[PDB]
Amino acid sequence: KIYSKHTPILVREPEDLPQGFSALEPLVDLPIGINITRFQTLLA
Amino acid sequence: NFNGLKGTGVLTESNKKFLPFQQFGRDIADTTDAVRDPQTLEILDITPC
Amino acid sequence: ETKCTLKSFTVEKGIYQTSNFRVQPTESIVRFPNITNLCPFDEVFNATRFASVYAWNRKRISNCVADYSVLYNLAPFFTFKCYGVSPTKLNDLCFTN
Amino acid sequence: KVSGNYNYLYRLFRKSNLKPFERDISTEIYQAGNKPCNGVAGFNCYFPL
Amino acid sequence: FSRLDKVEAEVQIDRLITGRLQSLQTYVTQQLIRAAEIRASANLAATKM
Amino acid sequence: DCTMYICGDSTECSNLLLQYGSFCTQLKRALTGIAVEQDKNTQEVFAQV
């Protein structure tokens, strides 16, 4: 289960987190079976 | 007998918008009342006779 | 009907309640996907070699039609007893995976 | 096998109990004595497979 | 019904018949109590009139 | 209702319910007793001329 909430066109300085309601939605489900305890986030 | 949901009622059309990860509809009584046909993917509504 | 319900042979003047009212269904409708891919049970069961206990393998079975009738047709299948579903009722249900 | 099939193995000791559907195969040497045992199996430390 | 064999599904279905059946009695008993205080208050209203 | 609340849309369920005796026959008698009395309270208070 992958819960992504990507807000574009948000006109604000970075500072800290803004005020609002976030409803995480499972975009895609992928049933492997293995469990993960460590990982690294890739960046371009 | 929608995918194993045995029951009786009149099958009509519905306007509620399921999410892509939503397939079953429930209510306060926790009895199914909204299912989607696997073959053609319209959203239906179930009400007893 | 009201004589039978009141368990008496005559009924006095008044209003009495009796059996309920219902409408029977007209016909039946059954809907299931259209895949017909014939899941590979014989590949799993009739495999030449089986893994070890400490390194048991996990196999994925999906997007295919399940048919346990031929699977149970094999004579030496003895230790068969299921918890969630009655064993004879595996040809009329569906599973996520 | 008449000649002896020994490709199937099990274990006789593990450090701790496991949660259901656990997933790892660590074949490290297991010891029973207080002193650490490293390398080859010796006293109070034996091959776990 | 369609998931369990009929030989022992009676045991499962019995513990659910009694669960719902006991719920109704508690509701009915509440109605008898509530109907008692209303009737005890209608006689007072009739006496006032 | 006796059955549609307990074994709604399950014909075989009602067959098992008959083995519990005459339970809801009391409920229909008890619930009716409240309903008829509610009309008598209104008659007593208002209908006096």
Short mmCIF file of C-alpha atoms in Angstrom, two decimals:
data_model
loop_
_atom_site.label_atom_id
_atom_site.label_comp_id
_atom_site.label_asym_id
_atom_site.label_seq_id
_atom_site.Cartn_x
_atom_site.Cartn_y
_atom_site.Cartn_z
CA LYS A 1 0.00 0.00 0.00
CA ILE A 2 1.45 3.31 -1.23
CA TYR A 3 -0.11 6.48 0.20
CA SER A 4 0.87 9.57 -1.78
CA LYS A 5 -0.46 13.10 -1.27
CA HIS A 6 1.28 15.37 -3.79
CA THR A 7 0.05 18.96 -3.72
CA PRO A 8 1.27 21.13 -6.61
CA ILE A 9 0.76 24.90 -7.10
CA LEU A 10 1.12 25.60 -3.37
CA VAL A 11 2.19 29.25 -3.11
CA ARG A 12 4.06 29.46 0.19
CA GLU A 13 7.58 29.76 1.55
CA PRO A 14 9.11 26.42 2.62
CA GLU A 15 9.55 27.21 6.35
CA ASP A 16 7.48 24.53 8.10
CA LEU A 17 4.45 22.43 7.23
CA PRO A 18 1.28 24.35 6.27
CA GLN A 19 -2.23 23.98 7.73
CA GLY A 20 -4.70 21.63 6.09
CA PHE A 21 -6.23 18.17 5.94
CA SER A 22 -4.32 15.27 4.38
CA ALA A 23 -6.19 12.11 3.36
CA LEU A 24 -3.61 9.52 2.33
CA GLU A 25 -4.90 7.29 -0.45
CA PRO A 26 -3.43 3.94 -1.58
CA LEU A 27 -2.52 4.68 -5.19
CA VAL A 28 -1.34 1.14 -6.00
CA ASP A 29 -1.36 -2.20 -4.17
CA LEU A 30 1.33 -4.79 -4.90
CA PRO A 31 1.19 -8.11 -2.99
CA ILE A 32 4.71 -9.57 -2.75
CA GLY A 33 4.93 -11.00 0.76
CA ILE A 34 8.40 -9.96 1.91
CA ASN A 35 8.85 -7.54 4.81
CA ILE A 36 11.26 -4.60 4.74
CA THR A 37 13.23 -3.16 7.66
CA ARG A 38 15.73 -0.87 5.88
CA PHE A 39 15.85 1.12 2.64
CA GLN A 40 17.21 4.21 0.91
CA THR A 41 15.20 6.87 -0.90
CA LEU A 42 16.49 7.47 -4.42
CA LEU A 43 16.84 11.01 -5.74
CA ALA A 44 17.49 12.27 -9.25
CA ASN B 1 -24.47 -13.26 -7.07
CA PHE B 2 -21.95 -10.48 -7.68
CA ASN B 3 -18.59 -12.17 -7.01
CA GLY B 4 -20.07 -14.31 -4.24
CA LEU B 5 -22.44 -11.74 -2.69
CA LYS B 6 -25.56 -13.87 -2.48
CA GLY B 7 -28.71 -11.88 -1.81
CA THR B 8 -32.05 -10.63 -3.07
CA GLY B 9 -33.10 -7.19 -4.25
CA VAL B 10 -33.63 -4.91 -7.21
CA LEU B 11 -30.47 -3.84 -9.04
CA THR B 12 -30.55 -0.17 -10.04
CA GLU B 13 -28.09 2.54 -11.04
CA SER B 14 -26.16 4.70 -8.59
CA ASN B 15 -24.45 8.09 -8.72
CA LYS B 16 -21.98 7.68 -5.85
CA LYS B 17 -18.37 7.93 -7.02
CA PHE B 18 -16.25 5.05 -5.78
CA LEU B 19 -12.51 5.55 -5.63
CA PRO B 20 -10.27 3.28 -7.73
CA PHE B 21 -9.45 1.29 -4.58
CA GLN B 22 -13.15 1.13 -3.60
CA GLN B 23 -15.30 -1.78 -4.80
CA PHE B 24 -17.82 -2.43 -2.01
CA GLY B 25 -20.29 -0.01 -0.45
CA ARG B 26 -21.58 -0.29 3.12
CA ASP B 27 -23.87 1.62 5.46
CA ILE B 28 -24.61 2.01 9.17
CA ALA B 29 -26.00 -1.52 9.40
CA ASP B 30 -22.75 -2.88 7.86
CA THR B 31 -24.61 -4.72 5.10
CA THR B 32 -23.46 -4.37 1.50
CA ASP B 33 -25.57 -2.05 -0.64
CA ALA B 34 -23.30 -0.91 -3.51
CA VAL B 35 -21.24 -3.18 -5.77
CA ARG B 36 -19.56 -2.87 -9.17
CA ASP B 37 -20.03 -5.45 -11.90
CA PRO B 38 -16.65 -7.10 -12.65
CA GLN B 39 -17.20 -7.30 -16.42
CA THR B 40 -18.59 -3.81 -17.11
CA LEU B 41 -17.49 -1.43 -14.39
CA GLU B 42 -20.55 0.70 -13.69
CA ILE B 43 -21.43 1.34 -10.05
CA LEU B 44 -24.71 -0.17 -8.88
CA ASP B 45 -26.94 0.27 -5.84
CA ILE B 46 -28.84 -2.46 -4.00
CA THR B 47 -32.15 -1.92 -2.20
CA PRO B 48 -34.43 -4.70 -0.92
CA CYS B 49 -37.85 -5.38 -2.37
CA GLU C 1 -55.84 -17.58 8.24
CA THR C 2 -56.89 -15.57 11.29
CA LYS C 3 -58.77 -18.57 12.69
CA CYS C 4 -55.54 -20.57 12.44
CA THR C 5 -53.46 -17.77 13.97
CA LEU C 6 -55.79 -17.15 16.92
CA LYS C 7 -56.04 -20.91 17.69
CA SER C 8 -59.81 -20.55 18.05
CA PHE C 9 -62.76 -21.66 15.95
CA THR C 10 -64.64 -18.33 15.91
CA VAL C 11 -63.27 -14.79 15.98
CA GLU C 12 -65.02 -11.82 17.55
CA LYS C 13 -65.48 -8.42 15.94
CA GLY C 14 -62.26 -6.46 15.70
CA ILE C 15 -59.00 -6.08 13.80
CA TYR C 16 -56.43 -8.88 13.89
CA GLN C 17 -52.89 -9.18 12.58
CA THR C 18 -51.68 -12.14 10.53
CA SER C 19 -48.72 -13.27 8.40
CA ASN C 20 -46.39 -10.71 6.82
CA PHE C 21 -46.18 -9.67 3.16
CA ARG C 22 -43.22 -10.24 0.85
CA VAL C 23 -42.38 -10.21 -2.86
CA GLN C 24 -40.48 -13.17 -4.27
CA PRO C 25 -37.58 -12.66 -6.70
CA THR C 26 -38.29 -13.19 -10.37
CA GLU C 27 -35.04 -14.80 -11.62
CA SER C 28 -31.27 -14.94 -10.75
CA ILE C 29 -28.12 -13.16 -12.10
CA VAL C 30 -24.48 -14.41 -11.67
CA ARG C 31 -21.38 -12.33 -12.66
CA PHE C 32 -17.66 -13.43 -12.67
CA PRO C 33 -14.53 -12.23 -14.67
CA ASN C 34 -13.63 -13.48 -18.17
CA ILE C 35 -10.06 -14.82 -18.04
CA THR C 36 -9.99 -18.64 -18.42
CA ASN C 37 -6.26 -19.00 -17.78
CA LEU C 38 -6.25 -22.34 -15.89
CA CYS C 39 -3.93 -21.73 -12.90
CA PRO C 40 -0.90 -24.09 -12.85
CA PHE C 41 -1.66 -26.44 -9.96
CA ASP C 42 0.01 -29.44 -11.61
CA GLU C 43 3.23 -27.43 -11.93
CA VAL C 44 3.30 -26.91 -8.15
CA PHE C 45 2.10 -30.35 -7.08
CA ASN C 46 3.89 -32.47 -9.71
CA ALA C 47 7.21 -30.62 -9.46
CA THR C 48 10.28 -32.81 -9.86
CA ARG C 49 11.99 -31.40 -6.75
CA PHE C 50 10.64 -29.74 -3.61
CA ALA C 51 12.39 -27.17 -1.44
CA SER C 52 13.60 -27.70 2.12
CA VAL C 53 11.72 -26.81 5.29
CA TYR C 54 14.09 -24.09 6.49
CA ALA C 55 14.15 -22.49 3.01
CA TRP C 56 10.57 -22.98 1.84
CA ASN C 57 9.65 -21.13 -1.35
CA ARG C 58 6.74 -18.77 -1.99
CA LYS C 59 4.93 -18.87 -5.34
CA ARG C 60 2.39 -16.43 -6.75
CA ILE C 61 -0.85 -17.65 -8.35
CA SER C 62 -3.00 -14.91 -9.85
CA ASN C 63 -5.02 -13.89 -12.90
CA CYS C 64 -6.21 -17.39 -13.75
CA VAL C 65 -9.15 -19.74 -13.21
CA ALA C 66 -9.00 -22.01 -10.17
CA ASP C 67 -10.15 -25.62 -10.64
CA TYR C 68 -9.61 -27.95 -7.67
CA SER C 69 -11.79 -30.74 -9.09
CA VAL C 70 -8.93 -32.35 -11.02
CA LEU C 71 -6.57 -31.60 -8.13
CA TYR C 72 -8.65 -33.65 -5.70
CA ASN C 73 -9.01 -36.44 -8.28
CA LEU C 74 -5.53 -37.69 -7.33
CA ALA C 75 -5.67 -40.80 -5.14
CA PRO C 76 -2.77 -40.30 -2.67
CA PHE C 77 -4.01 -36.91 -1.38
CA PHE C 78 -4.73 -37.88 2.22
CA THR C 79 -3.94 -35.07 4.71
CA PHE C 80 -6.57 -32.62 3.45
CA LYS C 81 -8.57 -30.58 5.98
CA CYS C 82 -9.20 -26.85 5.74
CA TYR C 83 -10.00 -24.18 8.32
CA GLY C 84 -11.46 -21.06 6.72
CA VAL C 85 -13.48 -22.81 4.01
CA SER C 86 -15.00 -26.28 3.85
CA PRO C 87 -12.84 -28.32 1.43
CA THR C 88 -15.75 -29.25 -0.85
CA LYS C 89 -16.63 -25.55 -1.31
CA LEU C 90 -13.47 -24.35 -3.09
CA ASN C 91 -15.06 -24.32 -6.57
CA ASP C 92 -17.60 -21.55 -5.87
CA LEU C 93 -15.61 -18.77 -4.14
CA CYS C 94 -13.01 -16.17 -5.09
CA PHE C 95 -9.75 -15.04 -3.51
CA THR C 96 -7.58 -11.94 -3.74
CA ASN C 97 -4.42 -14.04 -4.18
CA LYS D 1 16.86 -42.54 -1.64
CA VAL D 2 18.44 -45.93 -1.00
CA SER D 3 21.93 -44.43 -1.06
CA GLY D 4 20.89 -41.56 1.21
CA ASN D 5 19.23 -38.27 0.25
CA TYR D 6 20.81 -35.55 2.39
CA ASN D 7 19.80 -32.41 0.46
CA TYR D 8 17.03 -31.72 3.01
CA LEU D 9 18.04 -30.07 6.28
CA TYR D 10 16.57 -28.67 9.49
CA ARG D 11 17.88 -27.00 12.65
CA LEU D 12 18.49 -28.05 16.25
CA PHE D 13 19.06 -24.66 17.90
CA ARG D 14 18.10 -21.01 17.42
CA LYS D 15 18.88 -17.95 19.52
CA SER D 16 15.28 -16.72 19.75
CA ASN D 17 11.71 -17.53 18.77
CA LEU D 18 10.36 -16.23 15.45
CA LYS D 19 7.26 -14.30 14.42
CA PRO D 20 4.90 -15.99 11.93
CA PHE D 21 5.79 -15.82 8.23
CA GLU D 22 9.32 -14.73 9.12
CA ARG D 23 11.79 -14.25 6.26
CA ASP D 24 15.56 -14.87 6.67
CA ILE D 25 17.95 -17.81 6.54
CA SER D 26 20.90 -16.83 8.76
CA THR D 27 23.20 -19.87 9.02
CA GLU D 28 25.64 -18.33 11.49
CA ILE D 29 27.31 -20.51 14.12
CA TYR D 30 25.27 -20.86 17.31
CA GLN D 31 26.87 -21.11 20.75
CA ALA D 32 25.59 -22.24 24.14
CA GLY D 33 28.46 -21.26 26.44
CA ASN D 34 28.94 -17.86 28.02
CA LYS D 35 32.23 -17.23 26.20
CA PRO D 36 31.87 -16.09 22.57
CA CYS D 37 32.54 -18.67 19.87
CA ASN D 38 33.81 -17.52 16.47
CA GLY D 39 35.03 -19.20 13.31
CA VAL D 40 34.71 -22.97 13.54
CA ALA D 41 32.39 -24.78 15.93
CA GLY D 42 34.02 -25.82 19.19
CA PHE D 43 33.09 -26.41 22.82
CA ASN D 44 29.61 -25.12 23.73
CA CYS D 45 29.21 -23.94 20.13
CA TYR D 46 28.14 -26.23 17.29
CA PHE D 47 26.93 -26.15 13.71
CA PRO D 48 23.18 -25.39 13.76
CA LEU D 49 22.18 -27.20 10.53
CA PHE E 1 -23.42 -20.81 4.68
CA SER E 2 -21.47 -20.94 1.41
CA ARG E 3 -18.09 -20.83 3.19
CA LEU E 4 -18.52 -23.54 5.84
CA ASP E 5 -19.78 -27.10 5.69
CA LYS E 6 -23.37 -27.64 6.79
CA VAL E 7 -22.30 -30.23 9.37
CA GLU E 8 -20.87 -27.68 11.82
CA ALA E 9 -22.02 -24.33 10.40
CA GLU E 10 -25.04 -24.86 12.66
CA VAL E 11 -22.76 -24.24 15.65
CA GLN E 12 -21.52 -20.99 14.12
CA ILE E 13 -25.00 -19.92 13.03
CA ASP E 14 -26.50 -20.77 16.42
CA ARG E 15 -24.22 -18.41 18.35
CA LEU E 16 -25.36 -15.63 16.00
CA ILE E 17 -29.08 -16.42 16.24
CA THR E 18 -28.94 -16.16 20.03
CA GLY E 19 -26.88 -12.97 19.85
CA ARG E 20 -29.49 -11.12 17.81
CA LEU E 21 -32.39 -12.73 19.68
CA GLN E 22 -31.15 -11.47 23.04
CA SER E 23 -30.88 -7.96 21.58
CA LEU E 24 -34.62 -7.80 20.90
CA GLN E 25 -35.64 -8.73 24.45
CA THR E 26 -33.58 -5.89 25.90
CA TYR E 27 -35.33 -3.49 23.53
CA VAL E 28 -38.78 -4.84 24.39
CA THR E 29 -38.11 -4.70 28.13
CA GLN E 30 -37.05 -1.07 27.73
CA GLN E 31 -40.35 -0.29 26.00
CA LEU E 32 -42.35 -1.79 28.86
CA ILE E 33 -40.48 0.40 31.34
CA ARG E 34 -40.91 3.54 29.24
CA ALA E 35 -44.59 2.81 28.62
CA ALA E 36 -44.98 2.57 32.41
CA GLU E 37 -43.79 6.11 33.14
CA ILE E 38 -45.81 7.65 30.29
CA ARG E 39 -49.03 6.00 31.46
CA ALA E 40 -48.24 7.10 35.01
CA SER E 41 -47.99 10.65 33.62
CA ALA E 42 -51.13 10.57 31.47
CA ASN E 43 -53.30 9.79 34.51
CA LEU E 44 -51.88 12.88 36.19
CA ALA E 45 -52.72 14.95 33.11
CA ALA E 46 -56.23 13.48 33.04
CA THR E 47 -56.70 14.34 36.72
CA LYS E 48 -55.58 17.93 36.10
CA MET E 49 -58.15 18.32 33.32
CA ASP F 1 -40.87 -8.13 12.37
CA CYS F 2 -39.95 -11.61 13.61
CA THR F 3 -37.62 -12.91 10.93
CA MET F 4 -36.56 -10.24 8.44
CA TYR F 5 -34.63 -8.51 11.23
CA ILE F 6 -32.92 -11.77 12.26
CA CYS F 7 -32.73 -13.95 9.14
CA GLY F 8 -33.44 -11.44 6.39
CA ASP F 9 -33.15 -12.78 2.83
CA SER F 10 -32.14 -16.26 4.00
CA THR F 11 -34.88 -18.86 3.61
CA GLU F 12 -32.92 -21.65 5.30
CA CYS F 13 -32.26 -19.41 8.31
CA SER F 14 -35.96 -19.17 9.17
CA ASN F 15 -36.20 -22.97 9.30
CA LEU F 16 -33.69 -23.07 12.16
CA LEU F 17 -35.49 -20.22 13.93
CA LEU F 18 -38.59 -22.40 14.34
CA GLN F 19 -36.62 -24.61 16.75
CA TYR F 20 -36.41 -21.83 19.37
CA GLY F 21 -40.09 -22.06 20.29
CA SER F 22 -42.60 -19.22 20.28
CA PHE F 23 -40.28 -16.30 21.00
CA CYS F 24 -41.45 -13.56 18.67
CA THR F 25 -45.08 -14.57 19.16
CA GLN F 26 -44.62 -12.95 22.56
CA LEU F 27 -42.99 -9.91 20.95
CA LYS F 28 -45.89 -9.32 18.56
CA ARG F 29 -48.27 -9.71 21.50
CA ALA F 30 -46.15 -7.52 23.79
CA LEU F 31 -45.46 -4.77 21.25
CA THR F 32 -49.13 -4.67 20.26
CA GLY F 33 -50.10 -4.24 23.90
CA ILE F 34 -48.11 -1.01 24.06
CA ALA F 35 -49.49 0.31 20.77
CA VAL F 36 -53.17 -0.12 21.63
CA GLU F 37 -52.70 1.47 25.06
CA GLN F 38 -51.22 4.64 23.55
CA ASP F 39 -54.57 5.39 21.93
CA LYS F 40 -56.39 4.93 25.23
CA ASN F 41 -54.30 7.62 26.94
CA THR F 42 -55.35 10.19 24.35
CA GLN F 43 -58.99 9.15 24.75
CA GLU F 44 -58.90 9.60 28.52
CA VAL F 45 -57.27 13.03 28.53
CA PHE F 46 -59.19 14.77 25.74
CA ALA F 47 -62.41 12.84 25.08
CA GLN F 48 -64.53 14.04 28.01
CA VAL F 49 -67.37 15.97 26.31
#
